[PDB]
């Protein structure tokens, strides 16, 4: 039963370096899912959201990150946006289940969290599931620069700001994607 270190973990990583954990050789319970309902979004593609413990797959790959509440719709097949074209892009034939719930009593601090970075500019769109951890300068302008971070030389990882005194559009949602495969 390896669904106990994926959801209730201490600190998820950022959205750009989205952590992965492999699940194998144990049929999961799916008891906290679709029977506890403390989560916000359960937008679950392909397979029915109610029949999970009956079915069996080949590989169960889980991954996780933390995104703003106005960007919870971007974790989707092909729905373009800001994080779904530079940080983490699902493919168009992805089957699996997407999980999201609120996290403001854990991930927010008075004065900004300043440690949940997200990637702003990249030279092209992302491929499906391709992740990049490098912090190379985008150099939007004509000139190249040697990491000097000047005019049109950005740090591509913009830092989130997280305070408990905000709305729902600016609150970090702990979002975990489940990816399954048949053969």
């Amino acid at each position, epitope marked *: 039963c390896p669904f106990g270190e994926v959801f209730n973990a201490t600190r998820f990583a950022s959205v750009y370096a989205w*952590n*992965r954990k492999r699940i*194998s050789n144990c049929v999961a319970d799916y008891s906290v899912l679709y029977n506890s309902a403390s989560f916000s979004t359960f937008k679950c593609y392909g397979v029915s959201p109610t029949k999970l413990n009956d079915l069996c797959f080949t590989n169960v790959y889980a991954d996780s990150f933390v995104i703003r509440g106005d960007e919870v719709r971007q974790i989707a097949p092909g729905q373009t946006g800001k994080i779904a074209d530079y940080n983490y892009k699902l493919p168009d034939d992805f089957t699996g289940c997407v999980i999201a719930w609120n996290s403001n009593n854990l991930d927010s601090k008075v004065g900004g969290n300043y440690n949940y970075l997200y990637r702003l500019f990249r030279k092209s769109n992302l491929k499906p*599931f391709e992740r990049d951890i490098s912090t190379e300068i985008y150099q939007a302008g004509s000139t190249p620069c040697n990491g000097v971070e000047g005019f049109n030389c950005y740090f591509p990882l913009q830092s989130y700001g997280f305070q408990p005194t905000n709305g729902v559009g600016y609150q970090p949602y702990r979002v975990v994607v489940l990816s399954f495969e048949l053969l």
Partner: antibody, heavy 118, light 104 residues
Framework: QLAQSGAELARPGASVKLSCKAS????????MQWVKQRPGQGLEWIGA????????RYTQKFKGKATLTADKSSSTAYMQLSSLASEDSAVYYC?????????????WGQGTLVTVSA | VMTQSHKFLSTSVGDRVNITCKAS??????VAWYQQKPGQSPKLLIS???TRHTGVPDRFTGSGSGTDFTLTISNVQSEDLADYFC?????????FGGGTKLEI
């Protein structure tokens, strides 16, 4: 599910077009990834391509030297050595990750002896 | 980047042997372990150091996390006598660890 490759004995000034014929999966969506192995001194990573689009990635000690290409229609990938020498006489594999993106090199092909002393 | 412990490794048959890889920077549990019989091509044995691969016996248990990874081969038979590898998957390039050859 398995890779297939070729063999080579070449000259110290020439250029080599190796191969890695892929089979059994969707060649448009996975990454092909090339590693090299000298006798001893462990493995080493060279570069990769995305045969759907042509978005090649490299290592700074191996950029410019290997010019990786791919062809969608023939379902194979080509690497192209340049300025070979005595240090490049090694074994060159190709490997596809298990689940595309950020995973483990789960399918490896047979070795291609490339012997380029003289 | 990686490094290895022993370039050569001597064991008897029934003995338990740990092979350790210490990574220089931090890798949040994304290494893998390869064996390589001296003829053929190296195959995947352990990936995401806790998890094993298909076609592999339950003898091979890799463990550890953070930046110290360990492979405890329990009862080394006459078959499992080859070198061993390491990896990293997060930063480019995916630079390998050195070899570590197992022998009697």
């Amino acid at each position: 599910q398995l890779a297939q490759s070729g063999a080579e004995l070449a000259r110290p000034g020439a250029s080599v077009k190796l191969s890695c014929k892929a089979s059994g999966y969707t060649f448009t969506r996975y990454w092909m990834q090339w590693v090299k192995q000298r006798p001893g001194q462990g493995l080493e990573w060279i570069g990769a391509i995305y045969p759907g689009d042509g978005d090649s990635r490299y290592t700074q000690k191996f950029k410019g030297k290997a010019t990786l290409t791919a062809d969608k229609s023939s379902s194979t990938a080509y690497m192209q050595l340049s300025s070979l020498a005595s240090e490049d006489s090694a074994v060159y594999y190709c490997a596809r990750r298990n689940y595309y993106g950020y995973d483990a090199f789960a399918y490896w092909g047979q070795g291609t002896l490339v012997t380029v002393s003289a | 980047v990686m490094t290895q412990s022993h370039k050569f490794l001597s064991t008897s048959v029934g003995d338990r042997v740990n092979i350790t890889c210490k990574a220089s920077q931090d890798v949040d549990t994304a290494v893998a372990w390869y064996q390589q019989k001296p003829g053929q091509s190296p195959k995947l044995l352990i990936s995401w150091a806790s998890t094993r691969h298909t076609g592999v016996p339950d003898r091979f248990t890799g463990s550890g996390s953070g930046t110290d990874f360990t492979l405890t081969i329990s009862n080394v038979q006459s078959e499992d006598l080859a070198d061993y590898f390491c990896q990293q998957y997060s930063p480019y390039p995916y630079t390998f660890g050195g070899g570590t050859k197992l022998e009697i």
